[PDB]
């Protein structure tokens, strides 16, 4: 059993099916190795992959699954060779705990493309057992995964920028789109996508908002600065910003038109997908001929791009509209997330309403 | 009526609806101006893009129509102000004609990148007439989109190099898998296949060709001189050579998985699409997110580059494997095209067959 696997004890929410249930849940983690931190967990942003993986989208998932890789927390214990971080000191993990550690993605930082890089959840170990999210009491994780959290930072609103947040910032700065002046396009105002905005503005960037929900206009101009607002099931205002942006990130997390899309790119233009959905998208060659555009696709980003991207984050004071909700939430909570209900995030309180849940 | 629209008379091979048959046609040409240069066509390659033309895919096309733009001949007459061309000389015309000469693109001779793009058949003149391709008597065109034939180049095997040629060149250069070490593949060994991966080796690049054919496994190897030939439809080939490719030039003029050819790009590897399919690809967002890989488009290429195409290709002993038809042997070879039967590219002897056609 998951209680018996590994040394220290351990508690959260998992789902054990895909019906994506979640109900409290007995498991452990292994005990706190010489390079290892060791911290309780606070918070945890709700990603939109935690809703794809425990309903099985991908048809990837193993159960029983604990979803959470938004996690921030204190830490508590460290090995004896740890070096940036000490107890009581605010930290946080990602959508990596692992990598090969040999390969050239990974001496170039890019933990993030290692083909055998171990996901935070619904993965396997370096000792082959399965790996449990954030949606638990505490974590562990081998320094070189541990982020540090500046000081300025809130430990509730930054939480999702440790996988919404390096997600969207990684394409801006690899794809030369996090230029002043250039004309930058995101679709989804959810998660990933207001947060991009954030950045995208950040650098100096014209944003254009493109999503499917009018009633988020007003925000994406007057909260997040977008400078403009596309409806892109209207087609007379879509084909208006026909070909004005450099490039665009797409964080839709279904199937979607993308024709419309490249439409908006101009010359030369980049589609960066980021989000996942569970099925294969549409790509209409003369899209990709006609101009010479390219789509690309990123995931999260290694983990010193990782940092560097918090330290921006909390230098310009970034950081994700969320909403704060308990651990006994979370199936109402994701049912909110399926429905695009969130005022972009969800984030769990688990430090003061996780215990309460154990039967 | 297409023979009083302008002064000198024409003759060539035009669809009138899209069952694509062909068959003799009267028009005619704007007489030579200042920067003209006429010449009488000897030579034209057969396109496949020709036959998605006058079987109207696109839903673009227009009849009449008069297919063509692998052009090459003798030049009969020019105008006051041309510079590099002397009557007598042998010249080219491949898919442009003409642009706005007036746009950053152009100013980058990028003219097939140009919003308003003349292409040689099926499209809107200057001066506001349709165009007439290469299955056609006499030709005329500014001096900017004129070919200068190097003297070691064969007029029937080198008209091809007009489209096929620099279609594929162009996304090797443009995309930097014009080098030795890189491992470059090219899926569709057709009128632009063949010829992409003599550019390819010519370039010192090692290559893989991922076909449907297994008939072809030899040409390519012995004669091409590929180092490796794969078939798309035999997963256990297919899978050995997971992740083993730089970069891929895809000429397919028909839908086809995608995914397979993910699987043999390397992380951060390149799908270039040259290929004009009817229908949209399929496109798994997981593929590119993976490993942050690319897709980009490709169309031809700008005047310049042409020019320097195919004085490689002359510099290289580079030319397409041909075979060259009568002019009334239109039909037949258009249907064969369609069923890739054609042993690389069809190529018409109008100086010495269409006349004879002639009613
Ligand atoms: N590759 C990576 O590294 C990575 C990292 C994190 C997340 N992801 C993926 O990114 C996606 C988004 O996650 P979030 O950002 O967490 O999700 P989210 O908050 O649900 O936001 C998705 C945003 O997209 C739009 N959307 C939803 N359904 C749509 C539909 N049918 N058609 C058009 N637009 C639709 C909505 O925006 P509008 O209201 O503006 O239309 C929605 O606000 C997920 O697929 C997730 O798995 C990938
Ligand atoms: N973007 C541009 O600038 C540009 C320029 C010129 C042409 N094009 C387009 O490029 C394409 C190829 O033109 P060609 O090179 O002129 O044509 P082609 O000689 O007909 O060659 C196409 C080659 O692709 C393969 N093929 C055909 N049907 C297929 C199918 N259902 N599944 C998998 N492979 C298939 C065959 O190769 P195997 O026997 O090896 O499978 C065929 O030899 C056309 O769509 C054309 O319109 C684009
Ligand atoms: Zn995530
Ligand atoms: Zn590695
Ligand atoms: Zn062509
Ligand atoms: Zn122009």
Redesign the pocket.
């Known amino acids: 059993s998951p209680e018996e696997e590994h040394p220290v004890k351990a508690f959260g929410w998992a789902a054990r099916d895909q019906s994506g249930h979640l109900s409290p849940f007995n498991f452990s983690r292994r005990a706190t190795g010489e390079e290892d931190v060791r911290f309780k967990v606070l918070y945890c942003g709700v990603?939109?992959?935690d809703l794809?993986s425990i309903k099985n989208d991908w048809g990837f998932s193993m159960y029983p699954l604990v979803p959470g890789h938004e996690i921030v927390g204190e830490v508590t214990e460290v090995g004896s060779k740890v070096k940036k971080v000490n107890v009581g000191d605010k930290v946080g993990v990602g959508?990596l705990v692992g990598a090969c550690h040999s390969c050239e993605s990974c001496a170039n930082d890019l933990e993030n493309y290692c083909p055998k890089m171990i996901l935070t959840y619904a993965s396997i170990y370096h000792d082959g057992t399965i790996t449990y999210g954030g949606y638990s009491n505490h974590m562990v994780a081998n320094e070189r995964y541990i982020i540090r959290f500046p000081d300025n930072m809130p430990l509730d609103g930054g939480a999702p920028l440790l996988?919404?947040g390096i997600?969207v910032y990684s394409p801006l700065k690899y794809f030369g789109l996090d230029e002043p002046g250039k004309h930058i396009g995101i679709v989804?105002?959810?998660?990933?996508?207001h947060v991009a905005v954030k950045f995208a503005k950040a650098f100096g960037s014209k944003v254009t908002?493109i999503?499917?929900?009018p009633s988020?206009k007003e925000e994406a101009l007057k909260n997040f600065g977008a400078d403009s607002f596309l409806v892109?099931r209207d087609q007379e205002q879509m084909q208006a910003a026909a070909g004005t942006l450099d490039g665009i990130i797409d964080?839709?997390?279904?199937?979607?038109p993308l024709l419309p899309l490249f439409g908006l790119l101009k010359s030369h233009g980049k589609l960066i997908l980021?989000?996942?959905?569970e099925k294969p998208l549409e790509l209409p060659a003369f899209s990709l001929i006609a101009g010479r555009k390219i789509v690309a696709?990123?995931?999260?980003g290694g983990m010193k791009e990782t940092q560097e991207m918090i330290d921006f984050a909390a230098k310009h004071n970034i950081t994700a509209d969320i909403e704060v909700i308990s651990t006994d939430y979370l199936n109402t909570a994701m049912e909110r997330?399926a429905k695009?209900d969130?005022r972009?995030?969800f984030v769990i309180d688990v430090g003061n309403t996780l215990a309460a849940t154990k039967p």
């Open positions: 990603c939109h992959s794809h959508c996988c919404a997600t989804g105002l959810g998660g990933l996508g908002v999503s499917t929900s988020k892109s964080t839709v997390s279904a199937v979607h980021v989000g996942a959905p696709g990123s995931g999260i997330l695009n969130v972009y995030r």
